[PDB]
Design an enzyme around this catalytic site. Sequence first.
Site, mmCIF file in Angstrom:
data_model
loop_
_atom_site.group_PDB
_atom_site.id
_atom_site.type_symbol
_atom_site.label_atom_id
_atom_site.label_comp_id
_atom_site.label_asym_id
_atom_site.label_seq_id
_atom_site.Cartn_x
_atom_site.Cartn_y
_atom_site.Cartn_z
ATOM 1 N N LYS A 101 0.817 -1.217 0.000
ATOM 2 C CA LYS A 101 0.000 0.000 0.000
ATOM 3 C C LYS A 101 0.847 1.262 0.000
ATOM 4 C CE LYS A 101 -4.405 0.772 -0.213
ATOM 5 N NZ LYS A 101 -5.200 0.145 -1.303
ATOM 6 N N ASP A 141 -5.952 3.988 -6.895
ATOM 7 C CA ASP A 141 -6.697 3.985 -5.642
ATOM 8 C C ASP A 141 -7.491 5.282 -5.524
ATOM 9 O OD1 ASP A 141 -7.561 2.742 -3.343
ATOM 10 O OD2 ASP A 141 -5.550 2.440 -2.526
ATOM 11 N N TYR A 221 -23.454 0.997 -10.088
ATOM 12 C CA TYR A 221 -24.117 1.003 -11.387
ATOM 13 C C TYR A 221 -23.752 -0.235 -12.191
ATOM 14 C CZ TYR A 221 -23.895 1.727 -16.421
ATOM 15 O OH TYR A 221 -23.940 1.553 -17.784
HETATM 16 N N1 LIG Z 1 -7.809 -2.799 -4.045
HETATM 17 C C1 LIG Z 1 -7.160 -1.506 -4.233
HETATM 18 C C2 LIG Z 1 -5.733 -1.695 -4.748
HETATM 19 C C3 LIG Z 1 -5.428 -3.106 -5.224
HETATM 20 C C4 LIG Z 1 -5.125 -3.168 -6.707
HETATM 21 O O1 LIG Z 1 -5.987 -2.757 -7.509
HETATM 22 O O2 LIG Z 1 -4.022 -3.629 -7.071
HETATM 23 C C5 LIG Z 1 -7.952 -0.623 -5.191
HETATM 24 O O3 LIG Z 1 -9.139 -0.406 -4.946
HETATM 25 O O4 LIG Z 1 -7.374 -0.156 -6.172
#
Ligand SMILES: N[C@@H](CCC(=O)O)C(=O)O
Length: 415
Positions: A101, A141, A221
């Site tokens: 992250k 993100d 949606y």
């Molecule tokens: N789940 C996160 C990051 C994970 C990813 O896409 O690699 C997002 O909503 O983007």
Amino acid sequence: DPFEMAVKQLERAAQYMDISEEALEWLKKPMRIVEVSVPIEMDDGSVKVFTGFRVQHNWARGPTKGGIRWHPAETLSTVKALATWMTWKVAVVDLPYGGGKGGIIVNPKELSEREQERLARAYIRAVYDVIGPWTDIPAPDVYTNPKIMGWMMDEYETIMRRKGPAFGVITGKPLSIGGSLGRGTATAQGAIFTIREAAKALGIDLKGKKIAVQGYGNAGYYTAKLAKEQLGMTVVAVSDSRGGIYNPDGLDPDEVLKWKREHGSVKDFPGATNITNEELLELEVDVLAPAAIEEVITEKNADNIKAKIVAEVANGPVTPEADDILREKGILQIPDFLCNAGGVTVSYFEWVQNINGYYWTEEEVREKLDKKMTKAFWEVYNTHKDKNIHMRDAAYVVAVSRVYQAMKDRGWVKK
Ligand SMILES: N[C@@H](CCC(=O)O)C(=O)O
């Protein structure tokens, strides 16, 4: 604090499985945290320094994965908790990935496009030493999109001198530069596959049944649209942050989206009755898909839910007390990090395409997503039946068991 909440969740999970104390202590701490200063020169010529993060929680199963947030309220605690969550997210759906992250404490609304590009390139220059196609793969993100991903990939390729698959260093890219199809409907498609599998497990035929969706953004949606077409269901209630509408005979999500685009909201939709989110959560519908702000189902309204299946498309929209109340009613719940895992699976597919140099199509990506989501749901459901625990607990058991097995295989933990 978010990291404490995450740690507590992990301990609660470990309560239901046989895991050594040393492994739990290892999993309670991110394996590497990188905090860097991100300097950019603004449009007025001054140089401003931002705080950037890159947390790699665990990489026993493979390279870490996770998005980058550009939020003014970003904290190291938030990034660490989200990386910890991403570890279990990629473990439950069986990807060869760890948990990662990133984030920058910045208000992207006040930055121009040139300043945004400078911020992306400076972040890459700051965190280059801990990322890579086989080390850490960032992703879009909150407040980051494919444009920023393309800028970031270009900067990484410039630093990398094109000595390897620089396309695979980051996912969510535009289709022109290592783009992957199905990247707009990934979360909704995964949620639909999980809902179909849940109905199969419960013996419910979704042909003609009812669905209600909270939140009408991309996820909501597309969830309603894919449900109506693939599952043949009757969309009877949708809602945005403003208000909701209801129509027992069925709504057309395309027309609702057009109305939203025109009038700015789904309010006063023709042929439908305007309602609020709280009563919308309590219609007698076959499945319920909260795809909006977290913590919508609490102890206040947990007993009022009449849905047979609750698909937590959003990020933790149900509190543990509501979890217990819903389980007591026999209502099947799809855990939040299992329902919306279609986003990370398609990112994995994009990484595979970038690594191999051979991209697929729309049917190929959709076919694979079906396999991954079906297998993950059946694994979680089998744990649910075998351990006689909560659905959310079973997903944690599966993810932590996979990570623990990978850690034991490497020899990191001897017990
Ligand atoms: N789940 C996160 C990051 C994970 C990813 O896409 O690699 C997002 O909503 O983007």
